[PDB]
Design a protein around this motif. Structure first.
Motif, short mmCIF file in Angstrom:
data_model
loop_
_atom_site.label_atom_id
_atom_site.label_comp_id
_atom_site.label_asym_id
_atom_site.label_seq_id
_atom_site.Cartn_x
_atom_site.Cartn_y
_atom_site.Cartn_z
N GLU A 54 -38.31 -18.39 -0.44
CA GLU A 54 -38.56 -17.00 -0.79
C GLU A 54 -37.50 -16.53 -1.77
OE1 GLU A 54 -39.44 -14.78 2.67
OE2 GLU A 54 -40.05 -12.96 1.60
N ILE A 55 -37.91 -16.21 -2.99
CA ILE A 55 -37.07 -15.52 -3.96
C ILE A 55 -37.58 -14.09 -4.09
CG2 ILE A 55 -36.03 -15.55 -6.25
CD1 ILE A 55 -37.38 -18.55 -6.26
N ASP A 56 -36.66 -13.15 -4.26
CA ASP A 56 -36.99 -11.74 -4.08
C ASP A 56 -37.96 -11.24 -5.14
OD1 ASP A 56 -35.38 -11.61 -6.29
OD2 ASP A 56 -33.97 -10.14 -5.48
N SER A 155 -51.95 -24.05 10.21
CA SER A 155 -51.05 -23.24 11.02
C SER A 155 -50.64 -21.94 10.34
CB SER A 155 -49.81 -24.06 11.40
OG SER A 155 -48.74 -23.23 11.82
N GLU A 156 -51.52 -21.36 9.51
CA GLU A 156 -51.18 -20.19 8.71
C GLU A 156 -50.40 -19.16 9.52
OE1 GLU A 156 -54.57 -20.95 9.18
OE2 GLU A 156 -55.45 -19.21 10.18
N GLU A 157 -50.98 -18.66 10.61
CA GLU A 157 -50.29 -17.75 11.52
C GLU A 157 -49.82 -16.49 10.79
OE1 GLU A 157 -50.16 -16.12 13.91
OE2 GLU A 157 -49.56 -17.55 15.45
N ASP A 158 -50.76 -15.85 10.08
CA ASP A 158 -50.51 -14.57 9.41
C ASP A 158 -49.42 -14.72 8.34
OD1 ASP A 158 -51.19 -11.42 10.93
OD2 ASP A 158 -50.58 -11.77 8.85
N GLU A 159 -49.79 -15.43 7.27
CA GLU A 159 -48.90 -15.72 6.15
C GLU A 159 -48.68 -14.48 5.28
OE1 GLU A 159 -46.33 -16.87 4.40
OE2 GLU A 159 -47.02 -18.87 4.98
N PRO A 161 -46.77 -12.21 4.20
CA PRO A 161 -45.78 -11.96 3.14
C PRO A 161 -46.10 -12.73 1.87
CG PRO A 161 -44.70 -12.42 5.23
CD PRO A 161 -46.14 -12.79 5.39
N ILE A 162 -46.54 -12.01 0.83
CA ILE A 162 -46.87 -12.67 -0.43
C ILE A 162 -45.64 -13.33 -1.05
CG2 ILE A 162 -48.80 -11.12 -0.86
CD1 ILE A 162 -46.91 -9.68 -2.90
N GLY A 163 -44.44 -12.92 -0.64
CA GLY A 163 -43.23 -13.52 -1.16
C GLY A 163 -43.04 -14.97 -0.75
#
Lengths: 230, 50
Positions: A54-56, A155-159, A161-163
């Motif tokens: 994750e980069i901001d 196992s996506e599990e509510d991915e 965060p588009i980041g």
């Protein structure tokens, strides 16, 4: 009537490259053990690899940061290679924060207790601006074999965060494996051979532990196999 | 007749898989038939697999 192989001197030529020898091998099992070990080593050795980044300021792999030269995609490709040794936990979140002009190498990663960065000199990115600053969080998991981005979606599990930026996981530290069976003439014996296993890895698994783990897995499979319950 | 329009660009990353066509510069062509584990490939004396 047989003998058995005992682990004798285990030399390390470089930090990555190691030769492990097995001296008292009976005739005919040189090749058998060479090949079995080669197979298990290359296929099943558990290792660590970066799983997600994750980069901001970056929504997707294709955009670009101010003041950096590599594209986001190239930063991901560079992180894929990052060789890290984690001891206790399975999932670590490393934080990289650097500013100013300079090549941001892996050494700049914030040093946690349990994580060892095998080659701190590994380059990651190049800044080009006095005020340009990158912050990121690299999530590294333990796993065996090779799992791509696309399969792990199960196992996506509510991915949500588009980041979150998924990276293909090459969960395998062993790069190359060869074996040489050479006659080990001991002054009192007729037909014995030595196995010399030369192995090149990314510098995560130590040779002894690799060989031991392979022998373990093969032994377990043979355990199941010997007994036959029709 | 058109009130408004929205264009959307998707970027799809396509990995090599069985059935794609690969070729050389000399007219040799082919379909990728199977992806084998690293172990199965022949290997040189030194241990580098093909």
């Amino acid at each position: 009537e047989f003998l058995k192989p005992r682990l004798v001197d285990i030399e390390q030529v470089s930090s990555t490259h190691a030769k492990v020898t097995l001296e008292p091998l009976e005739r005919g099992f040189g090749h058998t053990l060479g090949n079995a070990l080669r197979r298990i080593l290359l296929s099943s050795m558990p290792g660590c690899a970066v799983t997600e980044v994750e980069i901001d300021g970056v929504l997707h792999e294709y955009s670009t940061k101010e003041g950096v030269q590599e594209d986001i995609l190239e930063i991901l490709l560079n992180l894929k290679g990052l060789a890290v040794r984690v001891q206790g936990k399975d999932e670590v979140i490393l934080t990289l924060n650097k500013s100013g002009i300079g090549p941001v190498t892996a050494a700049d990663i914030t040093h946690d207790g349990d994580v060892e960065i095998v080659k701190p000199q590994h380059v990651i990115c190049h800044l080009t601006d006095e005020n340009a600053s990158i912050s990121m969080r690299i999530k590294v998991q333990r796993g065996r074999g090779y799992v791509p981005a696309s399969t792990r979606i199960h196992s996506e599990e509510d991915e949500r965060p588009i980041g979150r930026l998924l990276v293909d996981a090459c969960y395998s530290p062993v790069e190359r494996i060869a074996y040489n069976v050479e006659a080990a003439r001991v002054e009192q014996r007729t037909d014995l051979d030595k196995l010399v296993i030369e192995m090149e890895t990314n510098g995560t698994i130590d040779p002894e532990e690799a060989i031991r783990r392979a022998a373990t897995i093969l032994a377990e499979q043979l355990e199941a196999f010997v007994d036959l319950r029709d | 007749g058109v009130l408004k329009i929205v264009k959307v660009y998707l970027a799809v990353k396509r990995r090599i898989q069985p059935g794609d066509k690969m070729a050389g510069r000399h007219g040799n062509k082919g379909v990728i038939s199977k992806i084998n584990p690293i172990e199965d490939m022949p290997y040189d004396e030194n241990g580098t697999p093909v």
